[PDB]
Write a protein that binds this ligand. Structure first.
Ligand code: MG
Ligand code: MG
Ligand code: MG
Ligand code: MG
Ligand code: MG
Ligand code: MG
Ligand code: MG
Ligand code: MG
Ligand code: MG
Ligand code: MG
Ligand code: MG
Ligand code: MG
Ligand code: MG
Ligand code: MG
Ligand code: ZN
Lengths: 151, 51, 56
RNA sequence: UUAUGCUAUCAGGUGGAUGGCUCGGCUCAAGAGCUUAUGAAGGACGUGCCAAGCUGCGAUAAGCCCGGGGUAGGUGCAUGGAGCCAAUGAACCCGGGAUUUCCGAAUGGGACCUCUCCGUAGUGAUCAUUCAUGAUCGGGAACGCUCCGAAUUGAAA
RNA sequence: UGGAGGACCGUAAACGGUAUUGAUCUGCAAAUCAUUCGUGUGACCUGCGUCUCGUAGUGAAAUGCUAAUCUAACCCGGCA
RNA sequence: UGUUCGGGUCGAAGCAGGGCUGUGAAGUCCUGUGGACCGUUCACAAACGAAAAUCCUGGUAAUAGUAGCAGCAAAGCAGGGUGAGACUCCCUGCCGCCGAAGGGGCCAGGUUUCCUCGGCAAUGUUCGUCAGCCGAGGGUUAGUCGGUCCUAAGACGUACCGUAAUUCGAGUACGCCGAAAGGGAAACAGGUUAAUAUUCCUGUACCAUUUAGCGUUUAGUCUGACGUCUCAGGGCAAGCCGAGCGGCGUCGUCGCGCCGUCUAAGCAGCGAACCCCGUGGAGAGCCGUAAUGGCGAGAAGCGGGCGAAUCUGUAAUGGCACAAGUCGGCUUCACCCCGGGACCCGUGAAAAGGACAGCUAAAUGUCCGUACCGAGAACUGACACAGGUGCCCCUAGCUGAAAAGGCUAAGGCGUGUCGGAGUAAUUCAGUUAAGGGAAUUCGGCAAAUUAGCUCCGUAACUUCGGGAUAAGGAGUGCCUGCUGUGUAGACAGCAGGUCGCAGUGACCAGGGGGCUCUAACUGUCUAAUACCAACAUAGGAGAUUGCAAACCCGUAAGGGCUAG
RNA sequence: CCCUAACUGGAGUCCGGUGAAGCUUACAUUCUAGUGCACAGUCUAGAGACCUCUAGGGGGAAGUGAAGACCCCGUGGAGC
RNA sequence: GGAGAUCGUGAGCUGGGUUUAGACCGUCGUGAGACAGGUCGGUUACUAUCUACUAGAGGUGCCCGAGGUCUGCGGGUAAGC
RNA sequence: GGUUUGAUAGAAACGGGAUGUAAGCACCAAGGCAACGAGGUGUUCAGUCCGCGUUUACUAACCAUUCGUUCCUUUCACUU
C-alpha cells in the first residue's frame, strides 16, 4: 500500500460523493494503486473495489410521535410556551379569518333567499362593528330575533 | 479574479518565465562563477510591481 | 479601526498605474499624469534642477 | 586521574585582517562637437539547439547585402555537449545599404486598457505661398541669451 | 378594527468601545483577546466610483484627522 | 619623488614566537610558515602614527541548551502498509471538531500557488518517506458567460481669453471618456479530462448585421424608468406526511429507521387583479374591503375586450446497481407576479436600446478574460500573524418566538502544526462551601441574587403622552378522554389520574426601591491613557442686503452662494 | 470579609526535539563600623567563609529600559 | 505608648490625593491665558547575570575498609503571655 | 521496606462500607369498541460499585551487571 490520496480524490469526483464517503477496500490496495485514470476508476467501481458509504440521516420517528400527541391537543401546557402571545398567533390573522367566515355566511344567507336587503345591510355593518364572535353566535341571534325569512 | 487585459497578462507571463534556475551547462562552462541571477523570487513574498 | 495594523487590511486598491512612456509605476489614475516623467501633463520630459546638488 | 576552574604556550575549527597583484576610478591637458515627421532619445515585448540575467538585434530578430583591409580558423560576457559555417576567402575591422513589432514629439479616434475602434489605407495643432508644396513640435554632460525671484546666515539681538 | 414613532427589548448580523483599572506587555497584535456593556427603521451602517490638501483642506470643535508623522504633512534643494 | 649604493626562487613582503641593542619612539637577527618582490646615502613631499567620540562597518561571546513552541477551537487510539529510518505519510474500524460557519458561490487582490512524476541541504515553531518547499513536464477552446455598447457624479482634449511666461488659470463652444454590483438581443440538459467547460462532443434551440427575393409605416406615443413604510391575493424552490416498489442497517425482544422512486431550455395552449366598452336604473339607502371606501358627474347585476407569474402537453430519450422508475396530500419563506393604503418645509437619475411591418433563403458573428485561492496557510499588516478586506451573497432535522443557545445531517477537518510522564510550591480560568451577612474597601470593585410565558394587581409625580415589565402575588411536568374558533395549517380551554427535594427541571433568560446635583431628549467626540456636565440640536433674539445687492475666492480672465 | 479549605482544566516542576533576545571596564563567597564629592562587595580595622549543583520568592547591586517631561540657563525655536 | 529603618517596604500590591493633555463654577486680565480655590474624567514596563536568604542533593578534606550507637564545640527559642 | 528460606504489589472469594430496591416477567391502573396506558405492587434491604481489611503463592519480585584492582607494563609479588 502506498499514498492513495490521489485515487481518493478521483473516486470522489467520479462518484460525486464527499471525500470521506468513499470506501477504498483495504485488501485491494495493490490493484487500486494502479488506477490513475477515470476509466480505470469506473472499472474499479463496477468490479466493487470502490463504493460510497451510505449517508446517515437524522431520524425523525420520536418527533413524529410527539407531533401526533400535540396534534391531539396534549404536551402544550403553560410550561411549554416560551414566546409571547401574538408571536404564536398574530391578531390580524384571527380577525381576518373571523370576518371572512362571517361575511361568507351572511352572503350565502342572502344568496339562497332567506334574508332581505335591509336586514342584510344592518347585519353586515353590525358584524363589521364586532358584535358577533363566531358563526354559531350569529346563527343564534338570527334564529332568536327572527330576522331570517325561513318558512 | 483580476480580469486582465492583453498587456498585463503579457507582462505576467514574462515575470513567470524569469523564475528559472540557471542552466547546469552554464555552471559547468563558467566554472562555478555564475550560480544565480537577481530575478529569482517567490510568489508568497514581496509582490511584483509588474502590473 | 486603529491607525496601525488594523486599518492596513483595506489596502486593496491602487493609486498609481504603469506609465507608457517610461515604464515606471508612477501614473496617477485620478489626475492622469505620470509623477516621474510628466507623461500626460506635457510633451516634454519632467526635469528639475533640485534633483541634484548645486554643482559647486 | 582534584571535580567545576585560573594563567601561559602549542595543534585544529570559525573568520576574513595584513601583504603582493589589479582590463576599475579620479584629476589635468590636446582635440572634436549637434540630432529628430525619410519618425529621434527612452521604454515594453520578443529573439539562441540545449539560454535564467546582462549585451546585441527586430517576425530577414547575438542577425542579411556590397566595396576595401586580413588570413586560417569561427560560433558575445562565459574554453560544456552535439552540430553547423569557412579557400565560392569566413571570423574580425573601416565605409555604404536593407529589414526595422508596439508605445513614445506620437500625429485618424480612445487609454487605473503599451493595446484597442472605424477602417472612409487616415495632411494631429499652429502657420507661409504661386495654393504644386514647405516650416515648427522632442532630445542633448555642462557652456549661452532673455524674463520672474527667497530664507537660513553676518551685523555676536 | 388600524399600524404611527430621530418609540421599546434584543443576536459575537452590523456599528461602537463603558468596567474588569482582568490576560498579554522582547505580545497573536508597533493597540489585540475574554467576560461585562451602548445603538440596532434611522441626524442609521456599508461596497464601488468621484471631488476637496499644506499658512491649505476637512472637522456635531478634541488643536481632532490629512498613508504607524500634525500648535503647520511628506520628498529633494538652500545645506558641509 | 629626485639621487647614490645594493638584496631576492641557494627563497622577498607579510604572519606567530623568541635573542640583542637603544632612556624611548623603534631597529636588527634567529626559528616555523610563505612563494615574489624589497631596501639604503643625501634631500623633498603628504589622502602620514588611535584606546576612548550612547564613534562607523564586519566578525563573534556571555546570557544559554535558557525563554518560547499553553490561555480564544484541551484529539486521538488499534490493526495493516510503504520506507535505510514512522507520535507526525497512506488504507480500514472506533472516538472527536464546525454545522445560519471552520460548508457552498464569487468581487478586489494574488499571479502558476493548479495537475502528474522525482527529491528532502534550506522553508514548515518538533520529526517527516509529507508539503502552498526544491527540479522536470503538462494544463485555461465562447455569436448566447462577462468586458466591449449607453449614460450618472465627474474627468480629459482642441479652440477662444488671461499670465512676464508655461507643463499654469475659471468660464464658453465643440468633442471625448467615466459602472466586471446602474440600463442591457440571444442556450439548455447530459457526457468527456489528471488538471477546461452554459466554451469541447450528442441532442434539441435561439438572436442579430449584410446580400437576394416578396410587401409596407401610425412617426408620434409607449417602454427602458425608478423613494420609505405597511398589507391582501396567486404561484413556486426548499420542507413534511400517507400508500406501493427496490436497496442498506438493526435483530437480547420488537419491527422499525434511512436512501431512491428522476427529466432542462425551446415550442403550443389557458389566464387572476387592475383597466376599457354595451346595457342596467339604486336612496326615509344600497354595494363592498384585512383596511381606507363607491354611488344619478350613474351603484348592484348582466355581457364583451386587452391582460402574469405559474400550470398542461411535447422536447422523450438522456442519465439510474437497463434496481425500482407509480401516486396522492399539507405547508411555503428569505424568491416571482399583481393590487391597495399611508408619509414627506425630503418628491425619490439619465441615455443607448426595444414596440408599433415584416416573411423566405444562404452567408457572416472579429477582439480580450477563462487554471487555482478568495482566507485561523494562496489578499493586506516584514511572517504558514487570534487583526482587517468578505458575513459580500446563500444554507437541512429536533427543542424553541427565532438565522438565539444546545444536540445531529450533507460538506470540510483531527494542521486555530511539538510530544512523553502524572509529583511539589506558585500562577491563568472555573465548581462548591458550616455560622455570620458589607463588619472588607477611597467606593458593594469583583462575584452572587432575579430571569420565559399566562392571570391578578400596580404608587408619588406628570408637559396628561407617561411613569410601567412599577412595586407585589399565584400557576407551569407527564398520562387518559375531550370541547370551542377556523376552509386549513394551527390556536385556545377543560375533566380525571400520577411522579419527583425540585416541572421556563439542562440551554437561554431584568435584582428592585427612595432622596439629591447636572444636561431637556435621540445624536457627536481626543484612531493608541479622557464616551463626560463638553459639541450638536429643536426653540428664542439680534444684524446686513431689493439682486449690476450683502458676504467671499482670483494677479487677471472670471467665479462660490445661485437652476437661489 | 471574620479565615480560609477541598477539587477541576491550562502552565510551572521532570524527560525527548527545536531554539532566541536584552543590562556586560575588570575581578567578585560576604557582614559590621569608619573614611571618602557627606548613600563602599573592591579603601581602613575587625568578623566570617570547604567547592559544585537544583528549586523558590524578589531584600541589595543607589538592578535594566531612556542624553528628565519638574526648576533654571541659551542676546536657541514654534504657535497664539 | 511614642518613634527609627532612603519620612522601612510600587523588578510586592493599591491608585483614593497631588502633578500632563478635556470641560464647568468663582475671582483676576482688554485678550491669549492664570489661581497658590473648588468639582467630574484620566495606560502602572522587565524571561534574575552577581550577591543574600529559605530548603533539597553530589563531591573533596579528616580517616586502616564498612556499619551501628553516642558525645556535644556551637546555633535557636516567648513557647508560653 | 521486600525479594521464594516470601504476604511486597495485583487477581479470586469473604468481612466492612456507598446508594436506594436493577432489567425482564406476572397482576392492577384513570380511561379507551379497540390498540395503547403515565404509574403502582411482587420477584427484591434488590442491582451496581469500593484509590479499605482477611485468607490464599493463583501471576509478577526472575535474569543479571557494577564498586570494594590507577591501567598497561612483566613501570609488576604477580601467574603460562
Ligand atoms: Mg496618522
Ligand atoms: Mg547649478
Ligand atoms: Mg545676527
Ligand atoms: Mg437595543
Ligand atoms: Mg534639508
Ligand atoms: Mg580600534
Ligand atoms: Mg455541534
Ligand atoms: Mg525541520
Ligand atoms: Mg464607455
Ligand atoms: Mg507540554
Ligand atoms: Mg445629554
Ligand atoms: Mg453647549
Ligand atoms: Mg546672555
Ligand atoms: Mg522594592
Ligand atoms: Zn512616465
Amino acid at each position: 500500500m502506498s499514498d492513495l490520496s490521489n485515487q481518493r480524490k478521483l473516486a470522489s469526483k467520479v462518484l460525486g460523493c464527499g471525500l470521506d464517503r468513499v470506501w477504498l477496500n483495504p485488501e485491494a490496495s495493490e490493484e487500486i494503486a494502479s488506477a490513475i485514470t477515470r476509466e480505470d476508476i469506473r472499472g474499479l467501481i463496477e468490479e466493487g473495489t470502490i463504493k460510497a458509504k451510505p449517508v446517515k440521516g437524522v431520524s425523525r420517528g420520536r418527533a413524529r410521535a410527539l407531533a401526533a400527541k400535540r396534534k391531539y391537543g396534549h404536551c402544550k401546557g403553560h410550561g411549554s410556551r416560551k414566546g409571547k402571545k401574538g408571536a404564536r398567533t398574530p391578531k390580524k390573522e384571527q380577525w381576518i379569518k373571523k370576518i371572512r367566515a362571517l361575511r361568507r355566511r351572511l352572503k350565502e344567507l342572502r344568496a339562497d333567499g332567506a334574508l332581505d336587503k335591509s336586514v342584510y345591510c344592518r347585519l353586515y355593518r353590525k358584524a363589521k362593528g364586532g358584535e358577533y364572535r363566531s358563526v354559531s353566535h350569529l346563527n343564534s341571534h338570527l334564529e332568536s330575533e327572527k330576522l331570517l325569512k325561513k318558512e | 479574479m483580476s480580469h486582465n487585459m492583453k498587456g498585463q497578462k503579457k507582462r505576467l507571463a514574462k515575470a513567470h518565465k524569469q523564475n528559472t534556475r540557471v542552466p547546469v551547462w552554464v555552471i559547468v562552462k563558467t566554472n562555478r562563477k555564475v550560480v544565480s541571477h537577481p530575478r529569482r523570487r517567490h510568489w508568497r513574498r514581496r509582490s511584483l510591481d509588474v502590473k | 479601526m486603529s491607525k496601525g495594523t488594523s486599518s492596513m487590511g483595506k489596502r486593496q486598491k491602487r493609486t498609481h498605474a504603469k506609465c507608457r512612456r517610461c515604464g515606471s509605476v508612477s501614473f496617477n489614475v485620478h489626475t492622469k499624469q505620470c509623477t516621474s516623467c510628466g507623461f500626460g501633463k506635457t510633451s516634454r520630459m519632467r526635469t528639475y534642477k533640485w534633483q541634484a546638488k548645486c554643482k559647486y
